[PDB]
């Protein structure tokens, strides 16, 4: 039982690292989309609902 | 559309197409102007009688 538990914990740490990387990439993508939506609104090609959704 | 292009937040093809549309509209306005001038050359006297 100790064998299996320690192995599982190790794999879990690795999975956590990978998930963190994925989420950082997602955050950057969302920031870019929000900046685009805000600039469009500033120039007058988009409403404010889009800004709030972003 | 122009300012968004300064930053890379809009496709370059779209801005190119906007520029082309402006140029085409100018050319067609020139066509209309020349047609009007062509008609005017027959009645430049400015008196009916």
From Swiss-Prot, chain A:
Outcome of mutating residue 53 to A: Decreases inhibition by hexaamminecobalt(3+)
Null allele phenotype: Cannot grow on efflux substrates novobiocin or fusidic acid.
Subcellular location: Cell outer membrane
Segments forming a coiled coil: none
Result, substituting residue 41 to F: Partial channel opening. Increases sensitivity to vancomycin, by allowing its passive diffusion across the outer membrane
Domain comment, as recorded: Forms a continuous, solvent-accessible conduit: a 'channel-tunnel' over 140 Angstroms long that spans both the outer membrane and periplasmic space. The periplasmic or proximal end of the tunnel is sealed by sets of coiled helices.
Reported function: Outer membrane channel, which is required for the function of several efflux systems such as AcrAB-TolC, AcrEF-TolC, EmrAB-TolC and MacAB-TolC. These systems are involved in export of antibiotics and other toxic compounds from the cell. TolC is also involved in import of colicin E1 into the cells.
Similarity comment text for this entry: Belongs to the outer membrane factor (OMF) (TC 1.B.17) family.
Designated name of the protein: Outer membrane protein TolC
UniProt source species: Escherichia coli (strain K12)
Protein's gene: tolC
Residues of the full protein shown: 344 to 397 of 493
Curated annotation (Swiss-Prot), chain B:
Annotated compartments: Cell inner membrane
Family of the protein in this entry: Belongs to the membrane fusion protein (MFP) (TC 8.A.1) family.
Function of the molecule: Part of the tripartite efflux system EmrAB-TolC, which confers resistance to antibiotics such as CCCP, FCCP, 2,4-dinitrophenol and nalidixic acid. EmrA is a drug-binding protein that provides a physical link between EmrB and TolC.
Subunit description: Homodimer and homotrimer. Part of the tripartite efflux system EmrAB-TolC, which is composed of an inner membrane transporter, EmrB, a periplasmic membrane fusion protein, EmrA, and an outer membrane component, TolC. The complex forms a large protein conduit and can translocate molecules across both the inner and outer membranes. Interacts with EmrB. EmrAB complex forms a dimer in vitro.
Protein's recorded name: Multidrug export protein EmrA
Organism name: Escherichia coli (strain K12)
Location of this fragment in the whole protein: 146 to 194 of 390
